[PDB]
Design a protein around this nucleic acid. Structure first.
Ligand code: ADP
Ligand code: ADP
Ligand code: K
Ligand code: MG
Ligand code: MG
Lengths: 368, 366
DNA sequence: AGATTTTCAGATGAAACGTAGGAAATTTACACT
DNA sequence: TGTAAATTTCCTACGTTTCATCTGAAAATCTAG
């Protein structure tokens, strides 16, 4: 009942429970970078909501404070870039780095990718620089993404790189070069029930108001999440629902939690579609009234026409679909029928009925 | 327990390669011209897996690189690890100091840029292509002819091809064989005795005091000697053996540990394989499990049963008759074509792997 | 017995299938000079 | 002139299903003295 903690933890929390070792080992490797000119690269692996992102922001964020105070750090530049948020593309990523490191005048298109690395050297020419790459599992999955990192990690301009991926098997996606010249991987083990109950008890302490939360209920949520799951972002945001709701009196009982849960699983789908590139939505409706992909594409080319907008190639369409399946919105079938003319791509809309409601709602609110 | 297991990873490269004395001779002799800057003869190496092929070559080239010190380039490229005609030609065009964009070019125009890199390169160069099997398997033979025609259609580079089966020499219809079998070495599988030498010379760098009984090594060797004289088996079997006697926190190794290793190794070989199996192939296998010394018929039968209990349309018996054989190659099932007068012509089918490892992983996917 | 004729139960071959998907070509948006 | 990424244009080879042809020794039938 004092929201400041629940959307900007990095401002409240001056420490990260159960990640102390991670945090220390880093500030060590960095002090050895500044005082020893010794490069280092690490790969933060872990499931979602295990503090990967949070930790990093904190290292970065505290070091911003450190060079202010210290002075021997005065001369160190930092860049924090989110390979997913930008494009996922090498070009997109390299541009951003060269943005902060150099100064910030930088092209996004037209330039030869090498002249980004050339640009970065010039902006840190002796002067030490640190790199953070959240969700580098995007960059890697794209052509030449590891072939970029390799030329980063193992180039001249003394630069230390931190890579936080969300996909764990992200090594099998990485070329020998890269993996070989890579530093140690640091794995964020998901939290257990006890760990969660403490974390929550911290958030409860700061954001909420004494009395409204007992001890069993904190125990309750941690029990829920923790058990094959891990994930702290849910755990925290889960409290928030049962919090919202329990503004009644209020005491917060097992109810408030249960609802908060359905409230969360189904509410997800809503914005999960709200924020869905324009044609994707049109494509998505195509599917709800025909699972046949070639057939859907026709009622797609229809809605485009009706909204004076160029319909995309069926190839690009089948992709947007394939891609919608990577999203967990639809499910592709592929039925093969030998002499009976087989090979048809199909797509199932998970709920069909829920999604439609959300699609309608979204189109409608975006007119008033 | 150890003091460097790294001396046991299929990376490390030793001072000497015992018993590959003739193979080394024959190569560095048939590569000699490089010293006066003169294109050598193309070599074609075949032998089973773990017979030294990759080892010898990577080592002979590191020796000539120093003996000659002479201008001389070699690029070792693993067709397996590359898995794409683009990537192969993209490194080949990187090793010659040439820059290619990640996208924008296309095979055809890629060979074009490559013929330029050669006629502009003043250093005789040897190209190593390991496990060509892989990259001729699920790609085209083409790369060969087009690489043959390449030094040929402008006057030079030299090649070394390393594959695994005799059957591969058959795929070389064009001058591809005529111009590669110029020199053709064979890497016979190792002897158990040979395999003991190889293990001992690498063990004394790896372990600790008398942490490792002689007796362990002789059987570690004779185990792998029984499964196609494989040198990489003999090494894993040993390393793991050590790692196992490590988690069992004691500072020695026991024969009991090696048999232990062997199984453990299967588990993971198969678990990996089984995980990357077509939903439908996982399916045929599953039935064979619930049946446990049966006939293709009974298999398709219990196959339809699970498609039914699962709501997932079946597949032709025709696809299942081969999906079986396919699991034979992977070494999960064993199926033989028996001939029994009035009991017909079936595949006697049975499990090669353990039953548990086959299901725990099986479930790991669904 | 020995010499046949079936008879079983599946192997092995081959064709027909029509788009899903991979690779080239074009377009988009820029940049530098 | 250029480059990197997004989309369009081309074209077949992919995983099967269907149709058609083989297989090979067991057993059940016949053979004739
Ligand atoms: N140990 C922790 N202490 C405090 N808050 C945490 C902790 N772990 C997770 N959180 C909260 O949950 C969110 C999820 O963690 P996050 O930084 O997203 O890691 P990831 O990038 O792996 O998802 C964080 O942004 C933070 O608000
Ligand atoms: N004669 C040998 N001496 C030492 N090690 C060997 C010998 N033959 C093979 N090996 C080892 O086997 C491992 C992989 O074998 P490798 O030669 O790559 O087999 P292949 O290349 O035939 O698949 C390497 O670690 C290498 O040390
Ligand atoms: K077309
Ligand atoms: Mg994250
Ligand atoms: Mg090899």
């Amino acid at each position: 009942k004092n929201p400041k903690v629940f959307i900007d933890p990095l401002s409240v929390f001056k420490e990260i429970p159960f990640r102390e070792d991670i945090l220390r080992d880093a500030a060590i490797a960095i002090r050895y970078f500044v005082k020893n000119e010794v490069k280092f690269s690490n790969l933060f692996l872990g499931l979602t909501g295990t503090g990967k992102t949070f930790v990093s922001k904190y290292i970065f964020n505290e070091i911003e404070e450190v060079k202010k105070e210290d002075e021997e750090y005065k001369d160190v530049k930092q860049a924090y870039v989110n390979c997913r948020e930008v494009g996922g593309t090498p070009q997109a990523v390299l541009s951003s780095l060269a943005g902060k490191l150099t100064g910030f005048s930088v092209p996004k298109h037209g330039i030869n990718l090498g002249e980004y690395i050339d640009k970065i050297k010039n902006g840190t020419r002796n002067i030490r620089a640190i790199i953070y790459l959240d969700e580098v599992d995007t960059l890697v999955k794209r052509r030449g993404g590891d072939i970029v990192l390799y030329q980063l990690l193992r180039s001249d301009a003394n630069i230390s790189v931190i890579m936080i991926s969300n996909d764990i098997n992200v090594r099998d996606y990485m070329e020998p070069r890269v993996l070989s010249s890579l530093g140690p991987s640091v794995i964020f083990k998901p939290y257990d029930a006890e760990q969660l109950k403490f974390i929550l008890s911290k958030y409860a302490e700061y954001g909420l108001i004494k009395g409204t939360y007992d001890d069993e209920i904190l125990s309750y949520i941690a029990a829920i999440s923790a058990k094959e799951h891990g994930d702290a972002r849910k755990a925290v945001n889960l409290l928030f629902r049962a919090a919202q709701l329990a503004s009644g009196g209020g005491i917060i009982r097992k109810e408030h939690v249960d609802k908060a849960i359905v409230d969360y699983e189904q509410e997800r789908l809503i914005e999960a579609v709200k924020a869905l590139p324009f044609h994707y939505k049109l494509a998505l409706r195509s599917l709800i009234e025909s699972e046949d992909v070639m057939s859907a594409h026709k009622m797609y080319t229809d809605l485009c026409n009706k909204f004076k907008q160029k319909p995309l190639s069926y190839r690009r369409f089948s992709d947007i679909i394939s891609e919608l399946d990577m999203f967990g919105i639809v499910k592709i079938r592929i039925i093969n029928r030998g002499r009976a003319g087989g090979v048809k791509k199909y797509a199932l809309v998970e709920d069909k009925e829920k999604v439609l409601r959300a699609l309608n709602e979204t189109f409608e609110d975006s007119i008033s | 327990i150890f003091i460097n297991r790294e001396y046991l990873l299929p990376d490390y490269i030793p001072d000497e390669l015992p018993h590959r004395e003739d193979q080394i001779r024959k190569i560095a002799s048939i590569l000699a011209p490089l010293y006066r800057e003169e294109k050598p003869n193309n070599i074609f190496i075949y032998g089973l897996t773990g017979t030294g092929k990759t080892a010898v070559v990577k080592f002979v080239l590191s020796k000539l690189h120093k003996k000659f010190l002479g201008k001389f380039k070699h690029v070792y490229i693993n067709t397996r690890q590359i898995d794409t005609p683009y990537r192969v030609l993209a490194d080949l065009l990187e090793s010659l100091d040439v820059k290619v964009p990640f996208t924008g070019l296309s095979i055809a125009e890629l060979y074009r840029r490559l013929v330029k890199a050669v006629r502009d390169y003043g250093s005789q160069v040897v190209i190593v292509l390991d496990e060509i099997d892989a990259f001729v398997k699920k790609y085209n033979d083409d790369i060969l002819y087009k690489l043959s025609r390449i030094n040929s259609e402008v006057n030079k580079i030299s090649f070394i091809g390393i594959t695994n089966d005799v059957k591969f020499v058959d795929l070389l219809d064009p001058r591809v064989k005529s111009s590669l079998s110029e020199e053709e070495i064979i890497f016979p599988p190792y002897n158990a005795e040979e395999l003991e030498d190889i293990l001992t010379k690498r063990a004394q760098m790896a372990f600790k005091p008398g942490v490792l009984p002689d007796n362990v090594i002789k059987l570690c060797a004779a185990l792998a000697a029984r499964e196609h004289g494989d040198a990489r088996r003999a090494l894993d079997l040993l390393r793991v053996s050590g790692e196992i006697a490590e988690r069992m926190k004691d500072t020695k190794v026991k024969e009991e540990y090696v048999y232990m290793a062997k199984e453990e190794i299967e588990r993971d070989r198969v678990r990996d394989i089984i995980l990357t199996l077509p939903f439908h192939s996982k399916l045929v296998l599953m039935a064979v499990v619930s049946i446990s010394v049966s006939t293709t018929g009974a298999v398709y039968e219990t196959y339809l049963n699970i498609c039914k209990k699962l709501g997932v349309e079946a597949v032709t018996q025709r696809r299942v008759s081969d999906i079986i054989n396919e699991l034979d190659m992977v070494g999960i099932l064993t199926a033989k074509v028996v001939n029994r007068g009035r009991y017909g012509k079936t595949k006697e089918i049975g499990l090669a792997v353990d039953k548990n490892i086959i299901v725990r992983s099986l479930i790991e996917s669904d």
